[PDB]
Amino acid sequence: ALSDADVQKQIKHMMAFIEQEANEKAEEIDAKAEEEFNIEKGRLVQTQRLKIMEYY
Amino acid sequence: TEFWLISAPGEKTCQQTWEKLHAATTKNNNLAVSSKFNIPDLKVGTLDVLVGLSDELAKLDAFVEGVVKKVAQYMADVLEDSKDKVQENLLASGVDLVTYITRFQWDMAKYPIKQSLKNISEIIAKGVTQIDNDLKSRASAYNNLKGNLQNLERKNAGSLLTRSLAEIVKKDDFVLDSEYLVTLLVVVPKLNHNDWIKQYETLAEMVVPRSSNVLSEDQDSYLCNVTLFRKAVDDFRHKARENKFIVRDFQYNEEEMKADKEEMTRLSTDKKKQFGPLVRWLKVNFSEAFIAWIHIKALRVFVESVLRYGLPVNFQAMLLQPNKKSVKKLREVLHELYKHLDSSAASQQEYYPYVYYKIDC
Amino acid sequence: QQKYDDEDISEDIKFLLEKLGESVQDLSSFDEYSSELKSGRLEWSPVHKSEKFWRENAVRLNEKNYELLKILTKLLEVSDDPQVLAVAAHDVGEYVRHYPRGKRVIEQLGGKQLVMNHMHHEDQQVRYNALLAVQKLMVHN
Amino acid sequence: RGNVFLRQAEIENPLEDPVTGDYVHKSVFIIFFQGDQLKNRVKKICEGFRASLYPCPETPQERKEMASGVNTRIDDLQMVLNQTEDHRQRVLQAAAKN
């Protein structure tokens, strides 16, 4: 029930959705990067600290 | 009354007036009630899974037709302050349910929208699930209580033959400190009462003389008792069963009366004292059930209006109430109105050229 | 099928049947077939008509590099004898019937075109034997 | 909710139907989507009515080249069909002779 222009527009709508999917994936991977940065820092820093404590 | 939910592309900024009551596009020429619908603010989340989301949403909708119409059926069966045909004014948490429908406001406070649509839908699903579980358990308990009261009042009824003698027989009727006798309440009707008082000796040897004693009256016959040695009880029963006399070796027990009546009165009073809470709890929980009901309906309206017009969520919803027997005219004029949106085919049948849902009370 | 008054005949026919049974069992083996395959002797062996052999011991024909099958492939282009060629064609057909990956290995070796050359051999029955082998090759193809 | 382009390819020379023998033409219309559950629904419905979803057009043109080679082997197989029908003809003639 659609001409060429209308079905093209529906395709562009599905595309605005795909770009939205890309954006939400980008912000989610940025967030998990924040938490993984934090936990990497915590564990690595604490291990170095413990080695320095026993050397002390 | 039966209402019609319609949603449109909502292109024009002033189209809301057309949705509400504009006389040019009003329904049945100002004879059908038309009102706007407060569109909830909702996310999108995803579209790939959204087909399944709408699917299981519809299945949940069917199941909750089940549960809430059973709630309606039970609150009608209570028949105290609410019945099938009287006292049917149903309140959506204080006001008339149509007043809440026409003043629909999304439940922003209870259910914030920062949460994804999926998780909100499962929240509502399990809320309805625990509502249903509470209904099942508590209504089954009340069914048990009602059955107990019915059995009590049933055992408190019946003739002398079909019920223990509560307010009829007493201690003096039966033999006291009996060494050899037993008092059998041999009921005799007046059709052959002279027969009994004359040949109770023929009915049995070694019988108490002048034992022709009559205790009370009933509509089928007259209660009377006979004091008899054991062999005399055997013989009297044997030759009185054929004489159309009811045989009964009842034992006097004031407890059999007092207990049953005490449980009857106490269970009835406690059942009412607990049925107060029943009606309060039931009407309340059904009002919030209907609130969440219209909320999930609005969520559906949003999902289908969105996927109808693609990604953008621009649409304008509105309640409606067509006149009976003017329905088809409204169908064809609205088809004329909305068939230019697509200009090709929107055999319109279920998927109307407008995003539609149906509700009826 | 015929009953006779001499029980000696029934005992003797039973003995004949059972001893020819384990005669076929003795002739039912895979190492003698491989020894003849190396030597190029391809007769109408009982193992060649043995339904059991093709049903079960076809997995044995999946040798290391499939050397026996390769030797048969060479025998196709060197030996022109109709009889051994018919035997080899039927053997290859059964092998592919019971092991399609072996058919794929044959197609890697190009043996389909070789048997296609052999369909035009002067011995008509060999043409039909190669036709049966090809017909077996056409499952999923 | 058809929202995708369509590829068309109409081929004449009506060929017998794969499962009924109807000497019927070919007229191919392609519609497909990218939602996985929508893909389940469309394949379910299409197999319910009529469909041939064995292939999957994609980037590799080497697939197309080997498929044209397969068409060559199909021609060779048709020649084998000629040989086989000759064989059944001559054997049935031999039997019917006597």
Swiss-Prot record, chain A:
Expressed within the midpiece of sperm tail (at protein level). Kidney; localizes to early distal nephron, encompassing thick ascending limbs and distal convoluted tubules (at protein level). The modification N-acetylalanine is found at residue 1. Signal peptide: none annotated. It comes from the Eukaryota. It is found in: Apical cell membrane; Cytoplasmic vesicle, Secretory vesicle, Synaptic vesicle membrane; Cytoplasmic vesicle, Clathrin-coated vesicle membrane. The modification Phosphotyrosine is found at residue 55. V-ATPase is a heteromultimeric enzyme made up of two complexes: the ATP-hydrolytic V1 complex and the proton translocation V0 complex. The V1 complex consists of three catalytic AB heterodimers that form a heterohexamer, three peripheral stalks each consisting of EG heterodimers, one central rotor including subunits D and F, and the regulatory subunits C and H. The proton translocation complex V0 consists of the proton transport subunit a, a ring of proteolipid subunits c9c'', rotary subunit d, subunits e and f, and the accessory subunits ATP6AP1/Ac45 and ATP6AP2/PRR. Belongs to the V-ATPase E subunit family. This is V-type proton ATPase subunit E 1. The chain holds residues 2 to 57 of 226 of the full protein.
Swiss-Prot record, chain B:
This is V-type proton ATPase subunit C 1. Pfam families: V-ATPase_C. Gene3D superfamilies: 3.30.70.100, subunit c (vma5p) of the yeast v-atpase, domain 2, Vacuolar atp synthase subunit c, domain 1. SUPFAM superfamilies: Vacuolar ATP synthase subunit C. Its main location: membrane. CDD domains: V-ATPase_C. Ubiquitous. Abundant in brain, liver, kidney and testis. It is a peripheral membrane protein. One of its GO terms (biological process) is synaptic vesicle lumen acidification. V-ATPase is a heteromultimeric enzyme made up of two complexes: the ATP-hydrolytic V1 complex and the proton translocation V0 complex. The V1 complex consists of three catalytic AB heterodimers that form a heterohexamer, three peripheral stalks each consisting of EG heterodimers, one central rotor including subunits D and F, and the regulatory subunits C and H. The proton translocation complex V0 consists of the proton transport subunit a, a ring of proteolipid subunits c9c'', rotary subunit d, subunits e and f, and the accessory subunits ATP6AP1/Ac45 and ATP6AP2/PRR. GO terms for cellular component: apical part of cell; ATPase complex; clathrin-coated vesicle membrane; extrinsic component of synaptic vesicle membrane; plasma membrane; proton-transporting V-type ATPase complex; proton-transporting V-type ATPase, V1 domain; vacuolar proton-transporting V-type ATPase, V1 domain. Belongs to the V-ATPase C subunit family. InterPro entries: ATPase_V1-cplx_csu, Vac_ATP_synth_c_sf. The modification N-acetylthreonine is found at residue 1.
Swiss-Prot record, chain C:
The gene is Atp6v1h. Subunit of the V1 complex of vacuolar(H+)-ATPase (V-ATPase), a multisubunit enzyme composed of a peripheral complex (V1) that hydrolyzes ATP and a membrane integral complex (V0) that translocates protons. V-ATPase is responsible for acidifying and maintaining the pH of intracellular compartments and in some cell types, is targeted to the plasma membrane, where it is responsible for acidifying the extracellular environment. Subunit H is essential for V-ATPase activity, but not for the assembly of the complex. Disulfide bonds: none annotated. Belongs to the V-ATPase H subunit family. V-ATPase is a heteromultimeric enzyme made up of two complexes: the ATP-hydrolytic V1 complex and the proton translocation V0 complex. The V1 complex consists of three catalytic AB heterodimers that form a heterohexamer, three peripheral stalks each consisting of EG heterodimers, one central rotor including subunits D and F, and the regulatory subunits C and H. The proton translocation complex V0 consists of the proton transport subunit a, a ring of proteolipid subunits c9c'', rotary subunit d, subunits e and f, and the accessory subunits ATP6AP1/Ac45 and ATP6AP2/PRR. Interacts with AP2M1. The lineage of its organism: Eukaryota, Metazoa, Chordata, Craniata, Vertebrata. This is V-type proton ATPase subunit H.
UniProtKB/Swiss-Prot annotation, chain D:
It is found in: Cytoplasmic vesicle, Clathrin-coated vesicle membrane; Cytoplasmic vesicle, Secretory vesicle, Synaptic vesicle membrane; Melanosome. Subunit of the V0 complex of vacuolar(H+)-ATPase (V-ATPase), a multisubunit enzyme composed of a peripheral complex (V1) that hydrolyzes ATP and a membrane integral complex (V0) that translocates protons. V-ATPase is responsible for the acidification of various organelles, such as lysosomes, endosomes, the trans-Golgi network, and secretory granules, including synaptic vesicles. In certain cell types, can be exported to the plasma membrane, where it is involved in the acidification of the extracellular environment. Required for assembly and activity of the vacuolar ATPase. Coiled coil: none annotated. Belongs to the V-ATPase 116 kDa subunit family. It comes from the Eukaryota. This is V-type proton ATPase 116 kDa subunit a 1. The modification Phosphothreonine is found at residue 59. Predominantly expressed in neurons in the cortex and in the dentate gyrus, CA1 and CA3 regions of the hippocampus (at protein level). Expressed at lower levels in astrocytes, oligodendrocytes and microglia (at protein level). In the cerebellum, present in Purkinje and granule cells (at protein level). Disulfide bonds: none annotated. Disruption phenotype: Embryonic lethal. Knockout embryos die at 5 to 6 dpc, before gastrulation. The chain holds residues 199 to 296 of 839 of the full protein.
